[PDB]
Design a protein around this ligand. Structure first.
Ligand SMILES: *[C@@H]1O[C@H](CO)[C@@H](O[C@@H]2O[C@H](CO)[C@@H](O)[C@H](O)[C@H]2NC(C)=O)[C@H](O)[C@H]1NC(C)=O
Ligand SMILES: *[C@@H]1O[C@H](CO)[C@@H](O)[C@H](O)[C@H]1NC(C)=O
Lengths: 51, 51, 51, 235
């Protein structure tokens, strides 16, 4: 059930950011994908709205 | 090999830049203050006539 | 706004007048926002804390 | 996590000499023993004594109290980057403001990355900051000359890395885009940034930033990062 996708690095802890949804997705593996193992990589993403 | 994710590269506006240090901290700054103070309250010179 | 020195108690009139009138004082965010504040941790033997 | 190479020395005597080192291994070893902070205190702060006995760089406290980069021992602090010759540390100028919020009572040294570089702030021998940190009050616990690792605070979570020079056009475009995306900010620590026809009272503002080795910093709100190892020999 872990949905808190904030490893003390995202910009969600701001006063001008606003509202959003902590989502995540999967990635690929290999030298071209960014890692050194043929396994899916954890890739987090955060979206919000501005004015 | 030391335990670290390695070097980090950030892209901004389609351009990839390799910074020296990456971190999030606070900093003293200023804000924009508009003191209009009734710029144009009410002032007009006109007249009325009958036809 | 009430001022008081830690360990000693209420300060005299000179320091509180300079804190309220000049603007080079040191207080919380409210005092820094309504009147201004200087927190450059300069050389000073003591400072009357206002809150 | 914890240690990287070894623990901290005992430092039985009062003040021990600091031999010069060239290899990366011994420099990392002396960084893990909190010797670089002692060297900085013996260069400009004239502080006699060592700090962080048997504590290492892992027990260093932080202001946000939730530092994810602390679990990654491979990341280098800005002080370590200055010790490695990457950047240049600036002296403690009285015209610079320090962001309040942490309790400096009982602390001996603390660093704060400013907008135009990196500055440090410490006290002399037998003194320590107060609850506000404006002056260095006397402390009985600082008379022994050995201070634990919890008395060292690092304002903000920031890590450094080797960089690559970039042309001036890209930097100018980035600065223009940054100053266009933030029309409310006018001045940062007495540095002209935008045109507002008037200065306002200081107010804290949380925003990320990055350095490219130039004079002023570049703040950015929306940014996408990517961690690559590349299996470099320097690591
Ligand atoms: C702190 O002071 C030491 C002592 O002088 C500095 O070490 C010198 O560094 C220069 C630069 O390479 C050498 O040429 C000298 O031989 C060193 N002196 C020694 C080792 O006694 C050091 O650079 C200063 N700064 C820091 C950040 O440590
Ligand atoms: C370091 O220890 C040596 C050991 O004899 C001695 O000179 C002294 O205790 C210390 N040196 C200092 C304080 O300069």
């Amino acid at each position: 059930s872990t949905s808190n996708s904030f490893s003390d690095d995202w910009a969600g802890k701001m006063d001008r950011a606003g509202l959003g949804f902590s989502g995540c997705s999967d990635g690929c593996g290999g030298a071209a994908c960014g890692c050194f193992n043929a396994a899916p990589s954890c890739i987090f993403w955060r979206k919000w709205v501005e004015n | 090999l030391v335990h670290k994710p390695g070097e980090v590269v950030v892209s901004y506006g389609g351009m990839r830049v390799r910074p020296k240090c990456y971190g999030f901290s606070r900093m003293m700054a200023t804000l924009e203050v508009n003191p209009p103070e009734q710029r144009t309250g009410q002032c007009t010179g006109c007249h009325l006539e009958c036809i | 706004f009430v001022c008081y020195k830690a360990g000693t108690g209420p300060c005299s009139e000179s320091e509180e007048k300079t804190c309220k009138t000049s603007g080079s004082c040191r207080g919380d965010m409210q005092f820094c926002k309504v009147a201004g504040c200087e927190h450059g941790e300069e050389a000073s033997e003591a400072k009357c804390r206002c809150s | 996590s914890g240690p990287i190479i070894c623990a901290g020395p005992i430092h039985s005597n009062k003040s021990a000499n600091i031999p010069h080192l060239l290899g990366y291994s011994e420099k990392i070893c002396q960084i893990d023993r909190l010797i670089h902070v002692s060297s900085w205190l013996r260069n400009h702060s004239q502080f006699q004594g060592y700090v962080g006995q048997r504590g290492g760089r892992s027990q260093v406290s932080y202001y946000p109290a939730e530092n994810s980069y602390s679990r990654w021992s491979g990341l280098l602090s800005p002080c370590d980057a200055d010790w490695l010759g990457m950047l240049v540390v600036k002296k403690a100028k009285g015209s610079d403001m320090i962001v309040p919020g942490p309790s400096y009572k009982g602390k001996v040294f603390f660093e704060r990355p400013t907008f135009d570089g990196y500055v440090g702030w410490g006290c002399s021998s037998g003194k320590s900051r107060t609850e506000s940190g404006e002056l260095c009050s006397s402390d009985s616990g600082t008379s022994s000359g050995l201070l634990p690792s919890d008395r060292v605070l690092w304002i903000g979570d920031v890590a450094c890395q080797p960089m690559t020079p970039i042309p001036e056009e890209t930097f100018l475009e980035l600065k223009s885009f940054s100053q266009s995306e933030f029309p409310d900010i006018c001045k940062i620590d007495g540095v002209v940034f935008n045109q507002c026809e008037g200065e306002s009272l200081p107010q804290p503002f949380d925003v990320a930033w990055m350095d490219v080795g130039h004079s002023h910093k570049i703040i950015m709100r929306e940014h996408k990062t990517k961690w690559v190892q590349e299996s470099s020999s320097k690591d």
